[PDB]
Design an enzyme around this catalytic site. Structure first.
Site, mmCIF file in Angstrom:
data_model
loop_
_atom_site.group_PDB
_atom_site.id
_atom_site.type_symbol
_atom_site.label_atom_id
_atom_site.label_comp_id
_atom_site.label_asym_id
_atom_site.label_seq_id
_atom_site.Cartn_x
_atom_site.Cartn_y
_atom_site.Cartn_z
ATOM 1 N N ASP A 1 0.815 -1.196 0.000
ATOM 2 C CA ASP A 1 0.000 0.000 0.000
ATOM 3 C C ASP A 1 0.867 1.272 0.000
ATOM 4 O O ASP A 1 0.758 2.104 -0.917
ATOM 5 C CB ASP A 1 -0.983 -0.039 1.169
ATOM 6 C CG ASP A 1 -1.808 -1.323 1.200
ATOM 7 O OD1 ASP A 1 -1.907 -1.971 0.095
ATOM 8 O OD2 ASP A 1 -2.309 -1.701 2.311
ATOM 9 N N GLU B 1 -9.084 -2.503 2.811
ATOM 10 C CA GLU B 1 -8.957 -2.175 4.247
ATOM 11 C C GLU B 1 -10.198 -1.478 4.781
ATOM 12 O O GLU B 1 -10.629 -1.696 5.907
ATOM 13 C CB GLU B 1 -7.752 -1.304 4.492
ATOM 14 C CG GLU B 1 -6.504 -2.120 4.625
ATOM 15 C CD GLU B 1 -5.236 -1.333 4.451
ATOM 16 O OE1 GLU B 1 -5.288 -0.044 4.488
ATOM 17 O OE2 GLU B 1 -4.191 -2.042 4.296
HETATM 18 MG MG LIG Z 1 -1.941 -1.613 4.451
#
Ligand SMILES: [Mg+2]
Ligand SMILES: [Mg+2]
Lengths: 260, 261
Positions: A52, A165
């Site tokens: 990420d 997420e």
């Molecule tokens: Mg992450």
């Protein structure tokens, strides 16, 4: 309208993407945001070695570099931040991430004195602190460290939040959740992988979370693409969705509804 | 529709209030929130000696006490927190605030080792830190301290944000701005005073560097929030802070957001 459809609408996820287009959309978004805020010169981002922050960091560095070429204004910089708690387990994924990004500046802020001082102050008042809780303290101290850098270097803090997420509420509130701008919001996990493939990232930058969640990224992603998954995975995802609503709304005022 | 009306709509401010009614509304709101979240037993709040935390704290303690009487569940508690950086200048306003609240529990968490460790780590990396910046670090460290207490004591964190701060963006983002529930949201500054009058608060708890910092008085801010006409200079000042603080008042900016454009 199913819950799935409504979640897909809120999080803005497409069933499939053109990676290159999505790259361009994000870079332009990041440039536009800076152009509009003429006192800002820097983006600031914690670099963990995970997918990420690697992707977000790369997209941000590209936005800066382009904007710097466009304006001839050298004060535009991307500031990578390393935020280890003590002596970090393997700095190797981080090293690869930094190599790929080639950041204008890299700062190392060790959060251990701050976290330890916080825990000691809690413990001295008789408050025992679990590992999970400490974990949230660390994530929040990283928020502090990044905002402190941004306050000094005329910066906006980049957040790494994305759809996989967000649906699970898999972030610390006011921690890694704490940020100014979310370049990856709308992308699911595999979509993140695709962007990194197109940018030429070392395959090691994108190959416990799933065990913690009780559900796979395969399932989360497929659900976000409007596909049918198992009932157990669906119920798990929907549990996390409802549980994480408070992380996904503003602080609750007397006029709010979503929690009722 | 003027900007003023639209700000008034967003912040929910009434031109005037019935203090006793507003008291009851807040307490019931705080109780409802707890009833709905059955794993929560505590409210947690930093107590500074200032009007906002004093009032919020009192309203929360009344919610807990009532709810505890209603349920016969003793695990319901209000946790006041003192959050000095070192040996605090005057703990006197704080003392009075705590006396007025009569909190179930009071914890003192000194943030100095944490803040100092944070600034050291920054300074060692060559990042100079102004007083303002350090100030924000302190407000964020208080957020941490309160969330840590709440994670251990099955708590929700109370925020003291209210309309007079909100309109001006006069808070640290993810600091004192960082909270679960905002009992005072909708009230302007003088409306806060009124509630505290009705609760019998020592007149010292509510009767500024703030106004100098803002370039505008609370008198003016309040009046604007009540839909009244103020001076042009005060209006332009308030409207500056409004536009500037929009990012403190929205979620993190995604590619779908508009408000900043
Ligand atoms: Mg992450
Ligand atoms: Mg205040």
């Amino acid at each position: 309208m199913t819950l799935q459809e409504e979640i897909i609408r809120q999080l803005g996820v497409k069933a499939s993407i053109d990676p290159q287009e999505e790259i361009r959309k994000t870079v332009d978004f990041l440039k536009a945001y800076l152009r509009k805020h003429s006192f800002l010169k820097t983006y600031v981002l914690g670099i963990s070695g995970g997918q990420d922050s690697t992707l977000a960091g790369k997209l941000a560095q590209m936005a800066i570099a382009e904007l710097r070429e466009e304006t001839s204004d050298q004060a535009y910089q991307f500031i990578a931040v390393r935020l280890p708690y003590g002596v970090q387990a393997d700095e190797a994924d981080a090293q690869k991430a930094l190599a790929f990004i080639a950041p204008d500046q890299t700062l190392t802020i060790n959060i251990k004195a701050a976290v330890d001082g916080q825990v000691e102050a809690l413990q001295a008042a008789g408050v025992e602190i679990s590992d999970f809780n400490k974990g949230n303290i660390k994530a929040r101290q990283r928020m502090i460290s990044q905002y402190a850098i941004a306050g000094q270097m005329a910066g906006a803090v980049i957040g790494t939040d994305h759809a996989a997420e967000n649906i699970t509420g898999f972030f610390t509130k006011f921690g890694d959740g704490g940020a100014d701008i979310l370049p990856l919001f709308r992308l699911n996990k595999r979509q993140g992988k695709a962007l990194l493939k197109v940018l030429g990232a070392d395959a090691a930058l994108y190959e416990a979370d799933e065990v913690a969640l009780g559900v796979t990224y395969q399932d989360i992603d497929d659900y976000l693409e409007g596909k049918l998954i198992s009932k157990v995975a669906q119920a798990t995802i929907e549990k996390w969705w409802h549980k994480g609503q408070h992380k996904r709304h503003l602080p609750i005022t007397i006029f709010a509804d979503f929690w009722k």
